[PDB]
Amino acid sequence: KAKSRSSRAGLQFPVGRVHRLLRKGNYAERVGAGAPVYLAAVLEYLTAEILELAGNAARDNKKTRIIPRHLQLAVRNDEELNKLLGKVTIAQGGVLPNIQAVLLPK
């Protein structure tokens, strides 16, 4: 048929998508080539981590739907993730469903 690298490498993520950048963007005369598979693997594993964290966060509220509110909740429960994007805030963040003693009555 046409022997593409996706089946040979066993990776669903696009391989030469980076090669597009490298070719048309003319970044250097010696850029990428091996870079695609590397970053693809890193992005895949980071996306797996984020998917696991979001799935764990969603089940806490006995609901099985994904909303960016829950992404903000999962990120803000992580101090390292907070330090990664400390100058960032995601919309609809609000406040957590656990209420402090300051607001509750005596």
Binding site: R69, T89, A91, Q92, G93, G94, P97, L103, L104
Partner: protein
């Protein structure tokens, strides 16, 4: 007593309280005031209103955190200046 009910209700819902048409109109007016005859996307307007909403809710959470720190709930303009000066954007 209704503060508890309001807190639970606002935790259950997430509707954007800033409306798309007034902020769209404000963006159009200000943009045409700076550089005349330029178009603006609706998606860009929605993203900008989301950015402003996130900025103000983060600033107000910081303001509340500083308030309860100084055994208070109501706040003075000095706290807002404080937050901006620690963030350094002012």
């Amino acid at each position: 007593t209704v503060a508890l009910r309001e807190i639970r209700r606002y935790q259950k819902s997430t509707e954007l309280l800033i409306r798309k048409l007034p902020f769209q109109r404000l963006v159009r007016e200000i943009a045409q005031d700076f550089k005349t005859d330029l178009r603006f996307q609706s998606s860009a307007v929605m993203a900008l209103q989301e950015a402003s909403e996130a900025y103000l809710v983060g600033l107000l959470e910081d303001t509340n955190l500083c308030a309860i720190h100084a055994k208070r709930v109501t706040i003075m303009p000095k706290d807002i200046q404080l937050a901006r000066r620690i963030r350094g954007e002012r």
